[PDB]
């Protein structure tokens, strides 16, 4: 059966694809329904508008084309999810029909009241990703929640900016906001609730979620937010110097007129593939093309904005993994021992030089962050130096910003739930010493284990993985339904009550094979990064 | 005039307390209420934030002029109907729209006075907690008649007359019937 | 019986006092046998000399007089043991017959030949006496000969000027003279002049660590038990002797521009006139104490032991859990702990007094404020008093002890590390507290096995008696063979006290639940020994 | 005169290993031994500290001149008998006393040679572990008669004859008489 649902701009034909598992019902998939006009000609580097109504019925069955990108290029591997970097060849299959017109979204609908909506904001970085990679037909059937995965402008065509009015920037965020508006004003026909629209994402996409909270454009579009392994206050979340990289790209592409308007006008003439294949490399632990603080979408820098309560009380669910900086130690991950002292010193010095770079004092900061991140009970272990380096990167880039944003959100009486993933599927090519890395929580949220290994996830899946996946999506769907991961659906996961994240008492819940509600996640190192390093 | 409430000697206070998990935070505010009194110094409605936050909104009649003052984080901004007299015993309605620092205030059918503060102003009223009507605990109790309190889609007096579980009345606040 | 034993200088008589307990044999006590000529007149401020032979016989039955001191004065109350300052009125009874001629020692012979254990008393360098500690229970239980001496303290024992007019370190020379008398006179008492152990707690322990690095004491002793003391801590030696000696000379009544003239004037004054003078040193320092001159202490003890200038003595180093109980003394009158305004003031004063470097006094203060605070209980209060106590204990007692243990074990010498944790429940001591400074002395000397004395009026249960027996057995085994568990076997029967290797700093967690742990406060010790020097 | 050990073709070595917990550190040292050989370059005795520490003491004949060289922590101090030729086949004796950094070397009835190194020198010989007679490991073998090795009250050669467990003989070393 191919059910037909009439939207506000026309009628679309879906499908009724069925799932392999037994406890999951049939799912209706409206793959490829557009939500904005194609930004092809003079509309390039312009905010999106409402789509054009099509007289008749549009066949929505095939996966829409992905936005232009370059996987086999100079991608920043440090910020990409581990499963995306490892299986790059398999991931490149999805991005094969890239075209400039890519503003489409895919809806997965199952078959206690009106079903909620969960939008997914993909993207490990701002130069790659597509919504076709994640099949939300399992999460939709399990939790009875309509799951919407979108495609938005990425990289060069999406986040180019100059600071002037020639190209304001953040066209990707505007595309996401347009998709949210389309969902808000068009989901009632598919059976969804336009008042329970959660938005969630991993990696840099989660940053967009945070950048979608401080923006006044998305005032009443969504209600909740699940930002996992992502923040808007890290080093690679916002682009603070867009003019330099924009001018570098303009020089490398052919036209570098002194006036920004002429350069933008020339850039609008180049075809979509010539200005993407350019290799514009940003500084380490930074981004070249990304969100830019201008005043329209992001008024000020996100760090300042969240301090002075510039948000509208969204129910929020932050989380981190155990060790996510698995690519911080990659040059010394295939050795019998760990990291030698002459290499630990060099790595920490490079870290300080690339990130902080304070001319006033660095011979003091380097020594104190060297002393803090080393185990003195096993000072000469060698192997217990890879763990400390991975913990250093994870604490600075992913854990401290997450704790800081959770505290700043909870300080203004907004429900904040903190989670710490600790389990990882046993990968064929991953090191045994490695723990749950960046993006390893995405297979469980989308219910990959209950369907089986795919090209993106070639893992063995046992019964424990299936149980953990079911529990994780139960928590996520409970949050989507009622804003409280314990209320609607009953669930060592039976007798655990997930409590809020108070600033005074930072209770969190420890997802894994041995769940427990804990009181402070790495209080020593988080306090070191938040309250001591600024003093030095 | 909607559900009219009469304030007498001594006065009183009526409080609408939001549920803890449903407290709103909004960029824009919309207040509207009709009144009739002869008091020279009184406070009609006071809107408070939760514990700690210094965000506030207050409507009061001082020296015969009605005015609204709000603290949105940067500094207190007050707009007052200076070129008028309001404590003449006649019924007058007042409306107030807020957008960050910008504030438009109107009374009766007279032209709307506008306040457009200069410099960078915060725009978020964080985590509304209680709506206070009467201003007795503040220091200037109000005596007179009030009607039709409209606050961002919440008719306080209309639902108070329905005896909803989230409203508490104390003092000489009586219902006109 | 009143047995008489002939020494190389004459014949002495002692008593055969019996002990309260029923499992210990009689002990023959010789109390008050001299070991050096009395430094009364022109011999004052001079190294001691061998005594004078006497005809006939001499009883040694009354406790010898103590050296002159001012116990009711401004003694440094931070370095003193907690039981000394708590029972100050009871401890003043022992020092009541103070006289300048105080060079004496007391032996407690129990009834190969038994070893000898000399005790170097002294919480600071200006108070105390050997008559306080009755080493009779340890002697009978361990079958060892315990010796307790009286040596010159304070102005009369440690005054120096830097030049040859008054070199100083007369107390250390008196201790070495007592060691020499023991070496050449203990064979007659049944002792072994080849198994002599030296031990002490507090500043006396520092004396031990200054007798190892001294060229004078080469073969006098062969073992050392330094508990809660070090020669590298801030209050171990005196680096500014001339300043304080000139202050004292000006205060007493004569400050000659020539050092020799000042010394000669001082030698003409009564002991009580210049002992009673109150010369206050800088905080966490001393006025009169051991001085680096070149004869007794050749160089700085921190530099001397880095280059391996010691003669391979077996060592038994130890600390207590919390010894800076007197650091937090103004905060013991509050129901809660210390406020946030009281935690950044004590640390600031600590940095100013101890480091005081203008270049980095604001970076070091912040980092030692961040390190010594529990971030899981950031606003507890009580766990700020606990962290202040831990900070003082770590800086003054734990870090120097670990540093000296590492330095001794690096040069291939047997080192055994211990961490006393149990403490007797005193009367006025706070319940939240733990084993303070010098709270192992009752257990080492067998106080619980006889009962509560004037110095220690604390209630003792059966656990205290068992722990006292355990620690006394450990000490006596160390004295007998240099191995705490070899001669006499003893959850304490199956614990093997292993050595203190520098690579793995193993130790024994002495207490109610002993166990051989791996690293004692590795994070804070490494903070004080490795990071702070780099700042 | 006393127990004499001869060296055959190739060479040999006598090693004394101190007990693991009984290695002494001495501020002053004595070293007396009678020797008779004609080898131009050789080493007679060599005292080494334990593993890690660089303290050592050795006695060696170079260019027919016998001399003692030691390292106690600061610098290598070598004092050598220069005004005498000793490798003439006769039976001689040599004594060497060390105190602090000062050294004294005396051969037979010749006047003593005293060395006082300049500056303040390290003194303690830290944790002697081995004594080596013959020095085949160093690279200069010995071929001659050695007797009466006296080292701080220790007579290694005498105990070697009595089949002491610690003493080990490796190579072509034979006992005479
Ligand atoms: C959709 O598909 C059906 C059957 O293939 C076809 O008849 C119809 O014309 C298609 N509509 C569009 C808009 O392509
Ligand atoms: C699942 O685990 C087994 C071991 O129990 C392993 O041998 C197998 O390869 C895994 N699954 C797949 C598809 O490889
Ligand atoms: C207030 O008014 C000014 C000028 O009309 C405008 O620029 C500003 O955006 C307004 N503020 C808000 C919050 O709308
Ligand atoms: C020692 O004391 C006893 C008791 O006081 C006394 O009888 C005896 O005579 C004294 N010894 C000498 C040598 O006088
Ligand atoms: C201390 O010991 C005595 C004697 O056993 C006992 O009577 C007393 O009760 C104990 N302490 C207290 C406070 O009970
Ligand atoms: C070495 O000789 C000098 C000069 O005679 C002397 O001063 C010094 O004390 C001697 N060294 C020792 C350790 O005696
Ligand atoms: Ca505010
Ligand atoms: Ca040496």
Short mmCIF file of C-alpha atoms in Angstrom, two decimals, chain A residues 39-383:
data_model
loop_
_atom_site.label_atom_id
_atom_site.label_comp_id
_atom_site.label_asym_id
_atom_site.label_seq_id
_atom_site.Cartn_x
_atom_site.Cartn_y
_atom_site.Cartn_z
CA UNK A 39 19.01 27.56 -3.91
CA UNK A 40 20.53 27.19 -7.38
CA UNK A 41 20.92 30.52 -9.18
CA UNK A 42 20.79 34.00 -7.68
CA UNK A 43 19.22 32.44 -4.57
CA UNK A 44 22.61 30.95 -3.70
CA UNK A 45 24.01 32.53 -0.52
CA UNK A 46 20.48 33.69 0.32
CA UNK A 47 18.10 32.51 3.05
CA UNK A 48 15.57 29.90 1.92
CA UNK A 49 11.93 30.65 1.19
CA UNK A 50 8.70 28.67 1.13
CA UNK A 51 8.47 25.94 -1.54
CA UNK A 52 6.39 26.00 -4.73
CA UNK A 53 3.09 24.13 -4.74
CA UNK A 54 2.95 21.26 -7.23
CA UNK A 55 -0.40 20.56 -8.94
CA UNK A 56 -1.15 16.86 -8.51
CA UNK A 57 0.60 14.14 -6.52
CA UNK A 58 4.37 13.91 -6.00
CA UNK A 59 5.97 10.47 -5.77
CA UNK A 60 8.10 10.51 -2.60
CA UNK A 61 9.84 7.13 -2.49
CA UNK A 62 13.49 7.55 -3.52
CA UNK A 63 16.14 9.06 -1.27
CA UNK A 64 16.70 12.73 -2.18
CA UNK A 65 20.12 13.90 -3.41
CA UNK A 66 22.67 14.94 -0.82
CA UNK A 67 24.07 18.45 -0.59
CA UNK A 68 27.41 19.10 -2.33
CA UNK A 69 30.44 17.95 -0.35
CA UNK A 70 33.78 16.17 -0.69
CA UNK A 71 34.39 13.06 1.41
CA UNK A 72 37.66 12.08 -0.30
CA UNK A 73 39.28 15.42 0.50
CA UNK A 74 41.03 17.16 3.38
CA UNK A 75 38.31 16.60 5.95
CA UNK A 76 39.04 17.35 9.62
CA UNK A 77 39.27 13.82 11.00
CA UNK A 78 39.54 14.89 14.65
CA UNK A 79 35.89 16.01 14.92
CA UNK A 80 34.20 13.44 12.67
CA UNK A 81 32.51 10.42 14.29
CA UNK A 82 34.66 7.31 14.51
CA UNK A 83 32.31 5.11 12.48
CA UNK A 84 32.22 7.75 9.73
CA UNK A 85 36.01 7.98 9.48
CA UNK A 86 36.63 4.22 9.68
CA UNK A 87 34.02 3.28 7.06
CA UNK A 88 34.65 6.25 4.77
CA UNK A 89 34.33 4.14 1.62
CA UNK A 90 30.96 2.75 2.73
CA UNK A 91 29.78 6.19 3.86
CA UNK A 92 30.68 7.65 0.45
CA UNK A 93 27.98 5.46 -1.12
CA UNK A 94 25.20 7.64 0.31
CA UNK A 95 26.81 10.85 -1.01
CA UNK A 96 26.87 9.82 -4.66
CA UNK A 97 24.05 11.87 -6.23
CA UNK A 98 25.20 15.23 -4.83
CA UNK A 99 23.42 18.24 -6.32
CA UNK A 100 23.02 21.88 -5.35
CA UNK A 101 19.26 21.44 -4.89
CA UNK A 102 19.14 19.25 -1.79
CA UNK A 103 16.54 20.88 0.52
CA UNK A 104 14.49 17.77 1.27
CA UNK A 105 13.47 15.91 4.41
CA UNK A 106 12.38 12.32 5.03
CA UNK A 107 9.59 11.37 7.44
CA UNK A 108 9.22 7.97 9.12
CA UNK A 109 5.81 7.40 10.70
CA UNK A 110 4.71 4.36 12.75
CA UNK A 111 1.37 2.63 12.34
CA UNK A 112 -0.84 7.49 23.94
CA UNK A 113 -2.23 10.42 21.96
CA UNK A 114 -1.10 12.32 18.87
CA UNK A 115 2.37 11.20 17.85
CA UNK A 116 5.28 13.55 18.66
CA UNK A 117 7.98 14.66 16.21
CA UNK A 118 11.75 14.13 16.49
CA UNK A 119 13.89 16.08 14.03
CA UNK A 120 17.49 14.90 13.60
CA UNK A 121 20.25 17.45 12.93
CA UNK A 122 23.02 15.36 11.40
CA UNK A 123 26.62 16.33 10.69
CA UNK A 124 29.83 15.30 12.41
CA UNK A 125 31.35 18.47 10.98
CA UNK A 126 29.98 21.29 8.82
CA UNK A 127 31.40 19.92 5.54
CA UNK A 128 29.86 16.44 5.36
CA UNK A 129 26.84 14.30 6.14
CA UNK A 130 23.40 13.53 4.76
CA UNK A 131 20.10 12.54 6.31
CA UNK A 132 19.89 9.37 4.21
CA UNK A 133 22.68 7.74 6.24
CA UNK A 134 20.48 7.17 9.31
CA UNK A 135 17.32 5.10 8.80
CA UNK A 136 14.86 6.25 11.45
CA UNK A 137 12.34 3.54 10.59
CA UNK A 138 13.19 1.58 13.75
CA UNK A 139 13.05 4.40 16.30
CA UNK A 140 9.76 5.56 14.77
CA UNK A 141 8.18 2.11 15.08
CA UNK A 142 9.52 1.42 18.58
CA UNK A 143 8.62 4.70 20.29
CA UNK A 144 5.57 5.60 18.16
CA UNK A 145 7.21 8.94 17.30
CA UNK A 146 7.42 10.48 13.83
CA UNK A 147 11.14 10.77 13.03
CA UNK A 148 12.21 13.46 10.55
CA UNK A 149 15.70 13.51 9.02
CA UNK A 150 16.57 16.53 6.89
CA UNK A 151 19.23 17.70 4.44
CA UNK A 152 20.67 21.21 4.70
CA UNK A 153 23.34 23.22 2.92
CA UNK A 154 26.82 22.22 4.05
CA UNK A 155 30.35 23.55 3.87
CA UNK A 156 31.14 26.16 1.26
CA UNK A 157 27.62 26.88 0.01
CA UNK A 158 26.00 26.84 3.45
CA UNK A 159 28.19 28.73 5.92
CA UNK A 160 30.20 31.13 3.75
CA UNK A 161 30.29 34.63 5.21
CA UNK A 162 32.26 37.87 5.09
CA UNK A 163 30.92 39.76 8.12
CA UNK A 164 29.43 42.43 5.84
CA UNK A 165 25.91 42.41 4.37
CA UNK A 166 27.11 40.84 1.10
CA UNK A 167 26.99 37.36 2.68
CA UNK A 168 25.70 37.28 6.26
CA UNK A 169 26.25 33.53 6.64
CA UNK A 170 24.63 30.66 8.52
CA UNK A 171 22.49 29.62 5.57
CA UNK A 172 22.58 26.06 6.90
CA UNK A 173 21.02 27.16 10.18
CA UNK A 174 18.42 29.10 8.19
CA UNK A 175 17.68 25.95 6.18
CA UNK A 176 17.25 23.99 9.42
CA UNK A 177 14.93 26.69 10.79
CA UNK A 178 12.92 26.60 7.56
CA UNK A 179 12.60 22.83 7.92
CA UNK A 180 11.43 23.30 11.51
CA UNK A 181 8.84 25.84 10.32
CA UNK A 182 7.64 23.44 7.63
CA UNK A 183 7.28 20.72 10.26
CA UNK A 184 5.44 23.08 12.60
CA UNK A 185 2.94 24.20 9.96
CA UNK A 186 2.63 20.91 8.03
CA UNK A 187 2.98 17.94 10.42
CA UNK A 188 -0.67 17.94 11.51
CA UNK A 189 -1.62 16.22 8.24
CA UNK A 190 0.81 13.32 8.74
CA UNK A 191 -0.54 12.75 12.26
CA UNK A 192 2.19 14.53 14.21
CA UNK A 193 1.81 16.99 17.05
CA UNK A 194 3.08 20.52 16.23
CA UNK A 195 3.56 21.23 19.96
CA UNK A 196 5.96 18.38 20.87
CA UNK A 197 8.73 18.84 18.29
CA UNK A 198 12.04 17.65 19.75
CA UNK A 199 15.30 18.28 17.90
CA UNK A 200 18.34 16.10 18.51
CA UNK A 201 21.71 15.49 16.91
CA UNK A 202 25.26 14.32 17.47
CA UNK A 203 28.62 15.90 16.79
CA UNK A 204 28.74 19.38 15.31
CA UNK A 205 25.08 18.97 14.38
CA UNK A 206 24.33 19.03 18.11
CA UNK A 207 26.12 22.39 18.13
CA UNK A 208 23.48 23.60 15.67
CA UNK A 209 20.86 22.50 18.20
CA UNK A 210 22.51 24.72 20.80
CA UNK A 211 22.85 27.46 18.19
CA UNK A 212 19.14 26.92 17.50
CA UNK A 213 18.28 27.65 21.15
CA UNK A 214 19.93 31.08 21.47
CA UNK A 215 18.44 32.20 18.13
CA UNK A 216 15.21 34.20 18.18
CA UNK A 217 14.30 32.89 14.72
CA UNK A 218 13.24 29.54 16.22
CA UNK A 219 11.06 30.92 18.99
CA UNK A 220 7.98 28.67 18.96
CA UNK A 221 9.03 26.10 16.35
CA UNK A 222 10.33 23.43 18.75
CA UNK A 223 9.95 22.65 22.45
CA UNK A 224 12.76 20.30 23.55
CA UNK A 225 16.37 19.58 22.61
CA UNK A 226 18.64 16.53 22.98
CA UNK A 227 22.24 17.65 22.43
CA UNK A 228 24.53 14.62 22.66
CA UNK A 229 28.32 14.94 22.37
CA UNK A 230 28.06 18.55 21.25
CA UNK A 231 28.10 22.15 22.47
CA UNK A 232 28.13 25.73 21.20
CA UNK A 233 31.07 26.81 23.39
CA UNK A 234 33.81 24.45 22.19
CA UNK A 235 36.73 25.46 19.98
CA UNK A 236 35.20 24.07 16.75
CA UNK A 237 31.59 25.18 17.25
CA UNK A 238 31.56 28.72 15.81
CA UNK A 239 33.70 30.40 13.16
CA UNK A 240 34.98 33.67 14.60
CA UNK A 241 37.13 34.82 11.64
CA UNK A 242 35.10 34.12 8.48
CA UNK A 243 36.64 36.90 6.40
CA UNK A 244 40.12 35.37 6.25
CA UNK A 245 38.95 31.96 5.07
CA UNK A 246 36.39 33.46 2.68
CA UNK A 247 39.08 35.62 1.06
CA UNK A 248 41.45 32.64 0.90
CA UNK A 249 38.77 30.59 -0.88
CA UNK A 250 38.02 33.50 -3.22
CA UNK A 251 41.70 33.82 -4.12
CA UNK A 252 42.00 30.06 -4.66
CA UNK A 253 38.83 29.93 -6.79
CA UNK A 254 39.78 32.77 -9.12
CA UNK A 255 38.17 36.07 -8.08
CA UNK A 256 39.41 38.05 -5.07
CA UNK A 257 37.95 41.52 -5.60
CA UNK A 258 38.69 43.94 -2.77
CA UNK A 259 35.02 44.85 -2.35
CA UNK A 260 33.16 41.97 -0.71
CA UNK A 261 30.00 42.45 -2.79
CA UNK A 262 31.83 41.92 -6.09
CA UNK A 263 33.60 38.83 -4.73
CA UNK A 264 30.30 37.35 -3.55
CA UNK A 265 28.67 38.13 -6.90
CA UNK A 266 31.50 36.35 -8.72
CA UNK A 267 31.28 33.40 -6.32
CA UNK A 268 27.57 33.10 -7.14
CA UNK A 269 28.59 32.41 -10.77
CA UNK A 270 30.92 29.45 -10.12
CA UNK A 271 29.26 26.06 -10.43
CA UNK A 272 28.61 24.08 -7.26
CA UNK A 273 31.50 21.63 -7.72
CA UNK A 274 34.43 23.97 -8.44
CA UNK A 275 34.15 25.97 -5.20
CA UNK A 276 33.67 22.81 -3.10
CA UNK A 277 36.71 20.86 -4.34
CA UNK A 278 38.97 23.68 -3.12
CA UNK A 279 41.20 22.65 -0.20
CA UNK A 280 40.85 25.44 2.36
CA UNK A 281 42.45 24.12 5.54
CA UNK A 282 41.59 25.73 8.90
CA UNK A 283 43.86 25.86 11.91
CA UNK A 284 43.96 22.74 14.05
CA UNK A 285 41.00 22.24 16.41
CA UNK A 286 39.09 24.96 14.51
CA UNK A 287 36.74 25.24 11.53
CA UNK A 288 36.92 27.15 8.26
CA UNK A 289 33.27 27.30 7.13
CA UNK A 290 30.74 27.14 9.95
CA UNK A 291 28.28 29.20 11.98
CA UNK A 292 29.24 32.87 12.18
CA UNK A 293 28.23 35.42 14.82
CA UNK A 294 26.45 38.15 12.87
CA UNK A 295 23.39 39.35 14.80
CA UNK A 296 20.57 37.81 12.78
CA UNK A 297 20.76 34.13 13.74
CA UNK A 298 23.46 34.27 16.43
CA UNK A 299 23.30 37.73 18.07
CA UNK A 300 26.52 37.44 20.08
CA UNK A 301 28.99 34.65 20.75
CA UNK A 302 27.24 31.63 22.32
CA UNK A 303 29.41 31.70 25.45
CA UNK A 304 28.24 35.18 26.47
CA UNK A 305 24.64 34.62 25.36
CA UNK A 306 23.90 31.68 27.67
CA UNK A 307 25.42 33.42 30.71
CA UNK A 308 22.80 36.20 30.67
CA UNK A 309 19.78 33.89 30.32
CA UNK A 310 19.15 34.44 26.60
CA UNK A 311 17.01 31.36 26.00
CA UNK A 312 13.34 30.43 26.29
CA UNK A 313 13.30 27.54 28.79
CA UNK A 314 13.65 24.46 26.58
CA UNK A 315 13.69 21.03 28.19
CA UNK A 316 17.22 19.84 27.53
CA UNK A 317 19.14 16.54 27.59
CA UNK A 318 22.93 16.81 27.37
CA UNK A 319 25.33 13.89 27.30
CA UNK A 320 28.90 12.77 26.74
CA UNK A 321 30.79 9.52 26.20
CA UNK A 322 33.64 8.11 28.26
CA UNK A 323 36.50 8.76 25.86
CA UNK A 324 35.63 10.65 22.68
CA UNK A 325 39.03 12.04 21.70
CA UNK A 326 40.02 8.62 20.37
CA UNK A 327 41.68 10.33 17.39
CA UNK A 328 43.84 12.51 19.64
CA UNK A 329 46.00 9.40 20.09
CA UNK A 330 46.14 7.81 16.64
CA UNK A 331 49.82 8.26 15.82
CA UNK A 332 50.59 6.15 18.93
CA UNK A 333 47.69 3.68 18.96
CA UNK A 334 49.33 0.70 17.19
CA UNK A 335 52.32 0.28 19.51
CA UNK A 336 53.12 -2.40 22.08
CA UNK A 337 53.58 0.21 24.82
CA UNK A 338 51.67 3.46 25.26
CA UNK A 339 53.15 6.96 24.97
CA UNK A 340 56.72 7.70 26.02
CA UNK A 341 57.52 10.70 28.19
CA UNK A 342 59.28 12.47 25.32
CA UNK A 343 56.08 11.98 23.29
CA UNK A 344 53.64 12.88 26.08
CA UNK A 345 55.53 16.14 26.60
CA UNK A 346 55.48 16.85 22.86
CA UNK A 347 51.76 16.10 22.54
CA UNK A 348 50.82 18.31 25.49
CA UNK A 349 53.05 21.12 24.20
CA UNK A 350 51.46 20.91 20.74
CA UNK A 351 48.01 20.93 22.36
CA UNK A 352 48.81 24.08 24.35
CA UNK A 353 50.41 25.80 21.35
CA UNK A 354 47.50 25.05 19.01
CA UNK A 355 44.65 25.83 21.41
CA UNK A 356 45.65 28.40 24.04
CA UNK A 357 48.75 30.11 22.65
CA UNK A 358 48.99 32.78 25.35
CA UNK A 359 52.21 34.82 24.96
CA UNK A 360 51.93 36.09 28.54
CA UNK A 361 52.39 32.69 30.14
CA UNK A 362 52.67 29.17 28.76
CA UNK A 363 55.61 27.68 30.70
CA UNK A 364 53.25 27.51 33.69
CA UNK A 365 50.07 26.25 32.01
CA UNK A 366 51.86 23.42 30.22
CA UNK A 367 53.41 22.07 33.43
CA UNK A 368 50.19 22.23 35.44
CA UNK A 369 48.07 20.50 32.79
CA UNK A 370 50.88 17.95 32.48
CA UNK A 371 50.85 17.29 36.23
CA UNK A 372 47.06 17.18 36.46
CA UNK A 373 46.61 14.61 33.67
CA UNK A 374 48.96 11.86 34.81
CA UNK A 375 48.53 8.92 37.19
CA UNK A 376 51.20 9.15 39.88
CA UNK A 377 50.51 5.64 41.22
CA UNK A 378 51.68 4.29 37.82
CA UNK A 379 53.89 7.17 36.72
CA UNK A 380 56.10 4.91 34.58
CA UNK A 381 53.36 2.61 33.26
CA UNK A 382 53.64 3.90 29.70
CA UNK A 383 50.36 2.33 28.63
#
